[PDB]
From a paper:
Kaposi’s Sarcoma-associated Herpesvirus encodes ORF74, a viral G protein-coupled receptor homologous to CXCR2, which plays a crucial role in Kaposi’s Sarcoma development through its high basal signaling activity. ORF74 was identified as a homolog of the chemokine receptor CXCR2, which is a member of the class A GPCR subfamily. ORF74 has been shown to have robust and high basal activity for multiple signaling pathways. In this study, we present cryoEM structures of ORF74 in ligand-free, BRIL-fused ligand-free, and CXCL1 & Gitrimer(Gαi/Gβ1/Gγ2)-bound states, providing an inactive-active pair of structures of a vGPCR, allowing comparisons and insights into the likely conformational transitions.
To obtain the inactive structure of ORF74, we expressed and purified ORF74 without the agonist CXCL1. We optimized the sample for cryoEM by reconstituting the detergent-purified apo-ORF74 in nanodiscs (first panel). CryoEM analysis revealed homodimer formation in the nanodiscs, enabling structure determination at 2.9 Å resolution despite ORF74’s small size (~38 kDa). Unexpectedly, atomic modeling showed an antiparallel orientation of the two protomers, an uncommon feature among GPCRs, likely induced during purification. Nevertheless, the apo-ORF74 model from the antiparallel dimer showed a strong structural fit to the BRIL-fused ORF74 map, while the CXCL1 & Gitrimer-bound ORF74 differed significantly. This suggests that the apo-ORF74 structure represents a bona fide inactive conformation. To further investigate whether the apo conformation adopts an inactive form, we compared the apo protomer model of ORF74 with the known inactive conformation of CXCR240. An RMSD of 1.7 Å from their superposition suggested similarities between these two structures including the positioning of the ECL2, 7 TMs, and ICL3. Notably, in both structures, ICL3 occupies a position that would sterically clash with the incoming Gαi/α5-helix of the Gitrimer in the active conformation. Structural analysis of inactive ORF74 revealed a segmented TM6 helix, composed of distinct TM6a and TM6b regions.
Residue numbers in the entry: 42 to 331
Write the structure that this text describes.
Amino acid sequence: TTVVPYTWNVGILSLIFLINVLGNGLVTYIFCKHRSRAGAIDILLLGICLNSLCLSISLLAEVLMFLFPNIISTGLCRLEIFFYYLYVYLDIFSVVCVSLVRYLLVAYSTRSWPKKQSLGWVLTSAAWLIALVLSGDACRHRSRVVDPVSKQAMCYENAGNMTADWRLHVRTVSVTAGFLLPLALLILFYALTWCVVRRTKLQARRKVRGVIVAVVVLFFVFCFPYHVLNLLDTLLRRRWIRDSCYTRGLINVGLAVTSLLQALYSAVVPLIYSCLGSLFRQRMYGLFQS
């Protein structure tokens, strides 16, 4: 059985695509118009918008394949899954980079190099290269297959006699490289920032930045559930926890619910900037008053 009907899934993904594209395109436009006077964390926060825009192509492809089964082909199956994994890796990598740069802003406060655009660009490129490698590795075999039992085409993991091995390998790579290690690095950098602040008893000149914290919190809100349920699913398919029809159906429902949350983070991200950021709020308010 399928948990979310066709109509609900298509509508939700279409609305998410619309808001994603509009919000992150506008944010990137404003950022490119005011680039010259930006900092490292500004570049990272723009990188989050670029990550969200990656998902737009994936969702557009998926929606067009739903609407038009006729155009389902190997090329679209590759492209959709490529952009999907690109988004999934890039979001967590960008959060890790944000944590790294705030660590560096305190570890090297006496230096000026932690606060330049150069650090943001270097970190963004380092994240993008890794995400591209990981996504391209996964999107190699997904092609057009026809089920004998229903005589309809669909995107599938067909890889020959080794289809199951590839199916397991892709999920294992996703879990290990896109949830576990990035989370450990994130925790490490925040713990180091807190430790260095505690050890120095840094003065009250430290004052909170509204935008940075909200995005990091809403990431753990809208995206973490999908990754944890993916980990549970992969544990099912590796027989590290016990099999059961009830458990399988429970996780089948859960994956359906949480996958929509993770896609909704793309729409959530630009709205955080449009309200908690003074520059984005002003500019977008002026644009919308036109």
